[PDB]
């Protein structure tokens, strides 16, 4: 930012390393919206295809729902996993190098010198 | 690109002759190139009018060119104050009155001050400040 | 970025055998068995050290070795070898499947007056071990220092502190 | 050095030849014995205009499978290899395609020439 | 970098420049498209010789094995612009400017 | 005089090049390029390639030969063009040997060329190497791997090829 | 063409492509492009009109150049490197080589008079497969050769890629034309970004893939080529037209819809690297490319054209043809905001 | 690679021929086989940022070798310092560089 970083098995969806992460909900917004561009994409079968739209056949429209939550399923597992190599890289980078990122210590607003811009 | 250094290689106001110089060959060479894919995607009819509309376009960037160069130095001496973006400001309707005059024209030439105005007191700001065009990747 | 230890020129002064191509090649199997053992030993050398100028001296006791051989040849079966490396030396290309018949009297020759056997096929193309006393070259390739790895990759994972903490994104 | 010297007496002999020819027989010639020739009467104008002839497919094709030819060439010094198993799959792979490619070209009109 | 490669890389820029400069035919363009192969395949064979990469003296052939694929195609393509157009000069099919 | 025939043979290949890439007739063209291609396989002969450079000598002549075989078929002009002809094929010839000799002129007189990449003239038999070949020769051991060593290169080759035919045809069909 | 050869040349161009997304030695990747030009040309000219055999042959020229300049940078790298693999140019003049050998098979700078006639000449079928599939093999070698890649260059062909897209499309009535115009703007935005940060070209190539698509089968199933011809589709079908009004809106990049996804996501990564002046310009630029989208929207149903009485039988049938994922492209192509955080997938 | 399938599938379809100091035929090395051998050595799997900066004398070694350009250079200074001190006449070539 993570095509380079070592151990990264080529052409893996969601590595065996990644099962230690929380599985999305299934109740998850990011999921269930996606689910929603199942059900907007049946309408739009429909419609292209001059059926009566909400009420054409089901057996289309519920194919395209199923479909769109499974592969929303693993999108925000694989989201989750990429941005957990974030957070992981995050603080063991941190950690191995201390020194470029010094501790600040407190120096309260009781000494600060910071000025009043005179709004009139 | 070495000649374009060249304008920051002599500092504003002095060598007022070799800043216009520098800038008249920085339009110049800029003409060339803009002569030169007008000449190739549009059709000449012969040698004698490929030179001569080379000619112009030339003629007017370096002038354009020169232009700019004396009113940046001029105004960095009358006011004796380098960092101005006033100084490039200024270069407005010496750029566009002169380019609408090159192809007369009181159309083109005044509505250019302004384009070029703040552009060149743009580009000023740039040199004053950090600012940068092709950074180059940090992160 | 530094100089070249050519070695000295006396060091590059030993004896030069002295035979025509077609000489060493009627040799060629009788020589490769009765003085394999200098042989292997200076060109190991070279296979491990990777510099001849660490190696002249094992090439010494070849020309030493090589000389030998030629001194025993001519003492017993001049004639005979000097009757066949003429015969190999008329062919263009230097064939062996041309003098047959001077190669039966050569070999028979140092069989009986020099207690050599010729090698059967393959024989010589086998590979030999050696004893050399030298000690294997650490760093043949003057290798500089390896770099430092670059820090493993380890830990354990957790999720992701405050989701995906792009713009409005909670979660 | 050999190769240059053979090379050079060669077209030092042929233009030899054609200086000889050209000079040792001497010329009384005119406009009409430098006409082009078109069995006696006039010709119609022509013998530069475009003349398309129809092998072109297969004139065409000759140079793909000049190219073919030229990626089997090495096939001597391939098999002196230790893995004859995969030499043997490749060689008869490349003449498959090659005669593949005949076929198809063969089926589909192809060698046939056009009227 | 002796001589001998400023020849070749000189070369294959007056190829490129007689490649950009198509005045009046197609085939003398494709020649000097199939010009470019030249240098690239000499050059090619001049590197890998000298470097002695021997399981790299393919890339030539590999090269040429392309090299009059795309000549084929240029021809082919020569062949129904000149059929339907009657000559080869590249002005004539400008009906695609609209 | 057989100081290194590299340079002057290479010279001829550039000469030959800058003919065809002045836009002569077609089949003047073929000349410009096949003295160019003849005097190219000459160059490798000599730097020990000898495959190779008769390789580039048999496919390209007959390359070049279904060219200009294909220019007098429909692309042959009814007063063809030559090497003097029009003054833009003049000028783009006469250009072109002017700027070739410029640039030998610029190599030979300094050694020390600086255009693009740096050139410095003192010999291209310099570059050989010390050091024998056994009983093979290296390039044609190099190329008879590819049945051994380039399995992979054989099979999107051989099937370039054959779909080179498909195209051919299907491009050519029309109608 | 025969069905069973059209597959088999189809396949030779995914395969084509496919190889330079996989191999690693330059002289494959060479291959590649030369395997995709070679099955292409064929596919261009199926319907044998007189103007494919030219708009083929504008494509063979200028590809072919780009492939020869190819080959000629990864000789001089192999000569100064010894390398044949796809990792870094350790000659500058050949990096500088290959950026326009490759612009020109995307078309991004003055390298790009092609791309609007040979998209014209075509019929639409080839123009959608000539305008999103072709990129992705050119796009891949910039990905991987990212890093030694010269910013002044790389910027400075995507900054005239944008400028001339759009103001090119400002004068275009075939819709072929606008279309490649448009393809041209977007060219420069996912070139942009390249030297920052690779996962947000491929963002932007998937974005613009979606809507490259969903636009043109909507102009196949519309069977339209000119503005005017599009216009009386309101009368015969008014859902596609409606539907290529959001699809419009969001290739000109409007938002909340999902081609701002892109545009928006690309400034704040350029912005990362002290880049204001540049971000600030094409935010600017774009907008001709909306000119002629809302124009193109103006003609097709925002305002009912003039019909034409042929139309009633027209009416009387229905297309049998069956676009596919059209639906679902659609769906892509409009609203996929919500999920902007996905493009950590494909980092 | 972009989409690395060589790694995955775990077969060799390239990672043949992409240097010299591979397995070539008959075990014919390359010219600079030894000096490009320690410059993967050294670089490998350092990634290419820290590549360019810490093992940069191998590469350098390497490309000279590639090209022999210094070397070369000082054999160029050699003959021509060479050539002028013989035309003016201060020394003369040794009998053994004769014949
Ligand atoms: C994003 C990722 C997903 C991508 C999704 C792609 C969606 C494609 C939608 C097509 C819907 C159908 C419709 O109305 O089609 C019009 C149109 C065909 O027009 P048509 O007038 O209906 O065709 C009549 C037939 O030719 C009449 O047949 P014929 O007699 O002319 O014979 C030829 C016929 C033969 O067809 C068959 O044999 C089958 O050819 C075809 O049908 C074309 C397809 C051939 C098979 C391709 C298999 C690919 C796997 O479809 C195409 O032109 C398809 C082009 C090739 C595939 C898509 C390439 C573009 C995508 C590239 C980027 C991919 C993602 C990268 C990241
Ligand atoms: C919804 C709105 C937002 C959309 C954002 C994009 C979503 C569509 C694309 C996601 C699926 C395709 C990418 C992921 C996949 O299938 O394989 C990933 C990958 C495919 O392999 P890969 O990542 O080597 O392939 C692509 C190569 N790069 C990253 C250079 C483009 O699977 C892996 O195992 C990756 C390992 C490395 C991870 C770092
Ligand atoms: C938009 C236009 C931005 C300003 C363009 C340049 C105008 C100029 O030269 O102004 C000089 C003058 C001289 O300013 P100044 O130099 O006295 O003070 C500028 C501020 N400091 C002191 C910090 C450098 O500046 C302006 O006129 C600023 C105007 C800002 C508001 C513009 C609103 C436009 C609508
Ligand atoms: C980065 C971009 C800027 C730098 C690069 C461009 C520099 C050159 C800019 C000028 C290009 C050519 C302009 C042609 C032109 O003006 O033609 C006469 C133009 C166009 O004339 P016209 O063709 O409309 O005249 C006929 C008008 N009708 C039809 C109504 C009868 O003149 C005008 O627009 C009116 C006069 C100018 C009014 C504005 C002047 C002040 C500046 C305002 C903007 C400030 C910011
Ligand atoms: C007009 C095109 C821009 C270049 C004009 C020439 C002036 C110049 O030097 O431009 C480069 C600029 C400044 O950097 P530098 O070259 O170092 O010179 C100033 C002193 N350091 O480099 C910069 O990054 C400074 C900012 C340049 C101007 C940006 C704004 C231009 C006007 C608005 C957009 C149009
Ligand atoms: C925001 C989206 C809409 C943007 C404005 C669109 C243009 C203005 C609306 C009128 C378009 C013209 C028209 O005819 O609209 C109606 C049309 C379907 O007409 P009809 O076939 O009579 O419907 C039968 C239904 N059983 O149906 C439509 O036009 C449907 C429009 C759908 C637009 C895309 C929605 C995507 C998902 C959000």
């Known amino acids: 930012m993570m095509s380079g970083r070592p151990g990264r098995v080529p052409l893996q969806f969601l590595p065996n390393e990644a099962r230690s992460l929380p599985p999305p909900k299934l109740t998850d917004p990011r999921l269930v919206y996606m689910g929603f561009l199942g059900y907007c994409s049946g309408l739009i079968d429909n419609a292209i295809r001059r059926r009566p739209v909400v009420s054409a056949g089901l057996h289309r429209q519920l194919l395209y729902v199923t479909s769109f939550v499974f592969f929303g399923y693993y999108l925000l597992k694989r989201q989750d996993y990429m941005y957990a190599l974030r957070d992981h890289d995050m603080f063991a980078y941190v950690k191995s190098h201390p020194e470029d990122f010094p501790e600040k210590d407190k120096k309260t607003y009781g000494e600060i010198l910071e000025e009043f811009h005179p709004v009139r | ?82 960092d101005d973006p006033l100084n490039y400001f200024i270069g407005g309707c010496a750029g566009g009155l002169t380019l609408g005059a090159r192809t007369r024209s009181y159309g083109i030439g005044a509505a250019a001050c302004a384009y070029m105005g703040l552009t060149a007191a743009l580009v000023k700001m740039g040199q004053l400040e950090g600012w940068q065009v092709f950074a180059e990747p940090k992160v | 970025p530094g100089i070249v230890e050519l070695p000295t020129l006396e060091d590059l002064k030993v004896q030069e055998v002295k035979v025509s ?36 001296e094992e090439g010494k006791l070849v020309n030493q070795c090589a000389l030998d051989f030629f001194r025993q040849i001519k003492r017993h079966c001049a004639e005979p070898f000097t009757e066949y490396w003429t015969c190999i030396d008329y062919s263009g290309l230097q064939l062996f499947r041309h003098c047959r018949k001077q190669q039966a009297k050569f070999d028979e020759c140092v069989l009986d007056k020099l207690g050599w056997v010729r090698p059967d096929l393959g024989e010589l193309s086998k590979v030999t071990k050696v004893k050399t006393d030298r000690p294997l070259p650490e760093n043949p390739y003057h290798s500089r220092a390896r770099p430092e790895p670059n820090p493993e990759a380890e830990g354990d994972l957790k999720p992701a502190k405050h989701g995906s903490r792009l713009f409005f994104w909670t979660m | 050095m050999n190769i240059m010297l053979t090379l050079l007496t060669n077209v030092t002999l042929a233009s030899l030849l054609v200086l000889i020819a050209f000079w040792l027989p001497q010329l009384n010639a005119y406009s009409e014995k430098t006409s082009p020739y078109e069995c006696g009467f006039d010709p119609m104008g022509s013998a530069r205009l475009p003349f398309s002839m129809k092998f072109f497919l297969v004139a065409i094709t000759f140079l793909l499978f000049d190219l073919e030819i030229a990626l089997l060439l090495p096939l001597p010094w391939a098999s002196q290899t230790n893995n004859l198993k995969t030499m043997l799959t490749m060689a008869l792979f490349l003449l498959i395609l090659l005669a593949a490619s005949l076929a198809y070209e063969w089926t589909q009109k192809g060698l046939e020439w056009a009227e | 970098m002796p001589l001998v490669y400023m020849n070749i890389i000189m070369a294959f820029a007056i190829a490129l420049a007689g490649l950009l400069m198509y005045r009046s035919h197609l085939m003398s363009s494709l020649l000097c498209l199939e010009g470019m192969m030249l240098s690239l395949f000499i050059m090619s064979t001049l590197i890998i010789l000298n470097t002695h990469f021997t399981l790299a003296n393919m890339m030539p052939i590999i090269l040429l094995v392309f090299a009059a694929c795309e000549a084929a195609l240029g021809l082919s393509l020569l062949v129904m612009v000149s059929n339907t157009y009657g000559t080869d000069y590249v002005q004539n099919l400008n009906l695609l400017q609209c | 005089m057989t100081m290194y025939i590299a340079f002057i043979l290479s010279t001829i290949f550039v000469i030959g090049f800058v003919g065809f890439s002045s836009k002569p007739s077609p089949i003047y063209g073929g000349l410009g390029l096949i003295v160019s291609g003849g005097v190219g396989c000459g160059i490798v002969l000599n730097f020990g390639g000898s495959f190779l450079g008769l390789m580039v000598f048999l496919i390209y002549l007959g390359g070049m030969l279904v060219v200009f075989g294909y220019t007098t078929a429909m692309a042959t002009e009814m007063y063809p063009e030559v090497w003097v002809s029009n003054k833009t094929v003049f000028g783009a010839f006469v250009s072109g040997l002017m700027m070739e000799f410029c640039m030998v002129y610029y190599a030979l007189k300094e050694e020390e060329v600086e255009i693009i990449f740096k050139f410095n003239g003192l010999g291209d038999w310099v570059i050989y190497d010390t050091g024998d070949s056994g009983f093979f020769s290296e390039e044609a051991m190099g190329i008879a791997a590819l049945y051994s060593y380039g399995t992979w290169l054989v099979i999107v080759t051989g099937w370039s090829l054959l779909i080179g035919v498909v195209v051919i045809m299907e491009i050519t069909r029309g109608n | 063409m025969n069905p069973i050869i059209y597959t088999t040349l189809i396949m030779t161009v995914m395969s084509g492509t496919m190889l330079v997304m996989i191999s690693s030695h330059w002289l494959l990747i060479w291959i590649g492009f030369e395997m995709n030009l070679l099955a292409m040309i064929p596919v261009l000219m199926k319907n044998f009109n007189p103007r494919a055999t030219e708009a083929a042959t504008k494509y063979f020229l200028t590809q072919a150049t780009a492939s020869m300049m190819l080959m000629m940078a990864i000789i001089i790298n192999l000569l100064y490197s010894g390398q044949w693999t796809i990792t870094k140019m350790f000659n500058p003049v050949a990096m500088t080589m290959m950026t326009m050998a490759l612009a020109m098979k995307l078309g991004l700078s003055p390298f790009h008079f092609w791309v609007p006639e040979v998209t014209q000449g075509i019929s639409l079928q080839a123009g959608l497969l000539l305008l999103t599939w072709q990129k992705l093999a050119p796009l891949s070698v910039l990905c991987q050769i990212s890093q030694s890649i010269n910013p002044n260059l790389m910027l400075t062909m995507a900054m005239l890629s944008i400028l001339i897209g759009g103001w090119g499309g400002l004068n275009q009535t075939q819709l072929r034309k606008i279309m490649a115009y448009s393809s041209i703007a977007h060219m420069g935005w996912m070139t942009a970004v390249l030297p920052y940060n690779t996962t947000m070209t491929i963002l932007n190539l998937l974005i613009y893939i979606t809507m490259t698509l969903a636009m043109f089968m909507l102009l196949i199933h519309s069977s339209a080529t000119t503005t005017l011809s599009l216009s009386h589709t309101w009368n015969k079908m008014p859902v596609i037209t409606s539907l290529m009004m959001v699809t419009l809106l969001s290739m000109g990049g409007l938002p909340p819809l999902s081609g701002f996804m892109p545009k928006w996501m690309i400034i704040q990564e350029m912005t990362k690297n002290e880049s204001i002046i540049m971000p600030t310009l094409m935010a600017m630029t774009a907008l001709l490319n909306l000119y002629f989208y809302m124009r193109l929207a103006y003609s097709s149903s925002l305002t009912m ?34 999920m902007t955080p996905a493009l950590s997938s494909l980092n | 690679p972009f989409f690395d399938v060589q790694k995955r599938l775990g077969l060799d379809l390239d990672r043949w021929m992409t240097i010299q100091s591979a397995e070539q035929p008959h075990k014919i090395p390359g010219r600079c086989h030894a000096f490009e051998k320690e410059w993967i050595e050294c670089a490998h799997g350092i990634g290419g940022i820290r590549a360019e900066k810490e093992c ?11 090209l022999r350009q210094k070397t070369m250079k000082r054999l160029s200074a050699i003959k021509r310092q060479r050539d002028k001190l013989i035309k003016e006449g201060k020394y003369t070539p040794p009998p053994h560089h004769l014949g």
Not at chain 2, 50 to 63: I, P, Q, W
Not at chain 3, 26 to 52: I, S, T, V
Request: hydrophobic letters at 35%; glycine letters at 6%.
């Open chain 7, 305 to 338: 054209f003039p019909s034409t009485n042929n139309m009633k039988m027209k009416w009387q049938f229905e297309h049998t043809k069956q676009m596919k994922l059209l639906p679902t492209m659609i769906v892509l192509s409009t609203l996929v905001l919500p």
């Open chain 8, 56 to 66: 940069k004398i191998e590469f350098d070694d390497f490309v000279e070798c590639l």
């Open chain 2, 1 to 82: 690109k070495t000649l374009l250094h060249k304008y920051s290689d002599i500092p504003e106001g002095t060598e007022c002759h070799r800043k216009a110089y520098a800038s008249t060959s920085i339009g110049g060479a800029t003409g060339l190139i803009v002569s030169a894919y007008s000449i190739a995607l549009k059709p000449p009819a012969s040698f004698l009018e490929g030179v001569a509309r080379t000619g112009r376009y030339t003629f007017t960037s370096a002038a354009i060119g020169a232009i700019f160069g004396l009113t940046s130095c001029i105004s960095a001496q009358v006011r004796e104050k380098p």
């Open chain 3, 21 to 56: 191509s077609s000489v060493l090649k009627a040799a060629a199997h009788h020589y490769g068995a009765q003085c394999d053992k200098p042989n292997k030993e200076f060109m190991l050398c070279r296979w491990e050290e990777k510099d001849p100028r660490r190696c002249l």
